[PDB]
Structure formats: structure tokens, C-alpha cells
Design a protein around this ligand. Structure first.
Ligand SMILES: C[C@H](OCc1ccc(CN)cc1)c1cccc2c(-c3ccc(CS(C)(=O)=O)c(Cl)c3)c(C(=O)O)[nH]c12
Ligand SMILES: [Zn+2]
Ligand SMILES: [Zn+2]
Length: 232
């Protein structure tokens, strides 16, 4: 009823949307992984009379439910999707999107890692993002590669019309006490990559983590703090 959704409002298989700003929503879903249940976020950005989707809802059935929820709540077609790294919470559901006519995109780094891992593979490669600090436009957003952090391929997304920074899994929520799933992370480089985000997007007003509650710019420093403490 208006607060940011959590698993206690989200059975696995259901999707909720949350209005972030004019023409910007997050999507929230829950999934089971290794015997525990987790929430995860993605983004939806209005692109004229179409929608740009950032990240799947972590699974085929969740992503089908996401498309149905978008039709119910927004009613504009999702035409393109970008996955911000190669893990299942970002690409799991790409096959569903592709069969629903959505054009799916990711960096070549993400595509190679997804393929090697056996995860679903976005169709189209996003060039121009291979060096840290790189940025490219994609419809109503800017895609930015900050360097290795949560994963070597992680991208962040900025919505300039609303000063919304979608950090994906390189950014953690304020209540977090650990750095999440670090199996593919670079804990030593992560703070430097976060510093690059801070320098590039100093006017961000909303910061959205890959998992958990949005907040403000403090999520960036908090993420560096939790990562440094995990490393140590
Ligand atoms: C889908 C993704 O795959 C990662 C992966 C990597 C490698 C392998 C081996 N090839 C297999 C899978 C995945 C799966 C499960 C958990 C996570 C978490 C996560 C973990 C703990 C917490 C704290 S919490 C809520 O427990 O208190 C939080 Cl927030 C987030 C993240 C994340 O940090 O982004 N990503 C996750
Ligand atoms: Zn991940
Ligand atoms: Zn994640």
C-alpha cells in the first residue's frame, strides 16, 4: 500500500512495481536460490510510447509475471531490455522476453560470461562500454561501466530526466550488513568503481540497489564501507 515492497509482500512468482519518478519504475520480485529467498530489483523507463526494461525479474515465470504486471499497471509495450550483468537475477528470463518480442541487450563481457556459465544470453551486444568510465546512451538512459565491483561486467544505469541512478548489484541497500553474493566480485577494485560512480553522477537524487530499498547517494558510500569490511 505505498511502501517499498519486500518479500513479505512478494510471494515467489509475483511481481510488484514501484513508481520512482515520472516515467521511472522499479520492479521487484522474489526468488529461491540455494534454499533461501531473496528480493531483487530492476528498472522500467518510459521511452515515448514504449518502455525500456532494465534486468529480468530473476527467472522465467517471474519475468512472464513482470510483463503481465507492466501491462496491467502501465499498458505500454516493452520493446528493449538491457541486462546489467550475467547472473540469473539479471538475465534469467531473457528467453521469455525474446519470445515476447523484446529485443535483449548486454555488453559483450556479460554475453560471454552468461554463455560460459550456462545462463540465458541477451541477443545484442552493447559496444562502447569495455573500459572503466565508459558511457553510452540507450534510449532514455545512460549506461555506464564503472569497473569491476560485484562482477567484472556490472553496468549502472542513469535516467537523466529524473536524476535516478540504478546501481544494480554493484550497489547495496543501507540496511545491508554484508556485501551479498561476492563469488564473482573484485572486492579490491569495488571501492574504486564506486568512487567512479560517485564522481560521474553527483546529482543523483534516488539510488536503487540491485537488491533492497532505494535511497539517496549515501547508498554508494555505504556500499564501499560494507565491501571494505567484508574484504577485511
Ligand atoms: C542470482 C545471483 O547469482 C549469484 C551467483 C554467483 C555465483 C554462482 C556460482 N556459479 C552462482 C550464483 C545470486 C544468488 C543468490 C544470492 C545473491 C545475492 C545476495 C546474497 C546475499 C544477500 C544478503 S541477504 C538478502 O541474505 O541478507 C544479498 Cl542482499 C544478495 C546477490 C547479490 O549480491 O547481487 N546475487 C545473488
Ligand atoms: Zn550478481
Ligand atoms: Zn544481484
Amino acid at each position: 500500500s505505498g511502501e517499498y515492497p519486500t518479500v513479505n509482500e512478494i510471494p515467489v512468482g509475483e511481481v510488484r512495481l514501484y513508481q520512482i519518478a515520472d516515467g521511472v519504475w522499479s520492479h521487484i520480485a522474489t526468488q529461491s536460490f540455494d534454499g533461501a529467498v531473496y528480493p531483487s530489483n530492476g528498472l522500467i523507463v518510459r521511452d515515448g510510447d514504449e518502455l525500456l526494461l532494465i534486468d529480468t525479474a530473476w527467472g522465467a515465470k517471474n519475468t512472464a509475471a513482470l510483463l503481465a504486471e507492466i501491462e496491467k499497471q502501465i499498458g505500454l509495450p516493452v520493446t528493449r531490455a538491457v541486462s546489467t550483468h550475467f547472473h540469473d537475477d539479471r538475465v534469467g528470463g531473457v528467453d521469455v522476453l525474446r519470445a515476447a518480442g523484446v529485443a535483449t541487450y548486454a555488453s559483450p563481457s556479460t554475453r560471454r560470461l552468461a554463455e560460459a556459465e550456462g545462463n540465458e544470453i541477451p541477443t545484442h551486444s552493447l559496444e562502447g562500454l569495455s573500459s572503466s568510465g565508459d558511457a553510452v546512451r540507450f534510449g532514455p538512459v545512460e549506461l555506464f561501466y564503472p569497473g569491476a565491483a560485484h562482477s567484472t561486467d556490472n553496468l549502472v544505469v542513469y535516467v537523466p530526466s529524473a536524476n535516478v541512478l540504478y546501481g544494480g548489484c554493484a550497489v547495496h541497500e543501507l540496511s545491508s550488513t554484508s556485501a551479498g553474493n561476492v563469488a564473482d566480485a573484485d572486492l579490491a577494485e569495488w571501492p574504486t568503481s564506486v568512487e567512479r560512480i560517485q564522481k560521474h553522477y553527483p546529482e543523483a537524487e534516488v539510488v536503487i540497489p540491485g537488491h533492497g530499498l532505494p535511497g539517496g547517494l549515501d547508498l554508494l558510500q555505504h556500499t564501499a564501507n560494507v565491501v571494505k569490511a567484508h574484504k577485511n
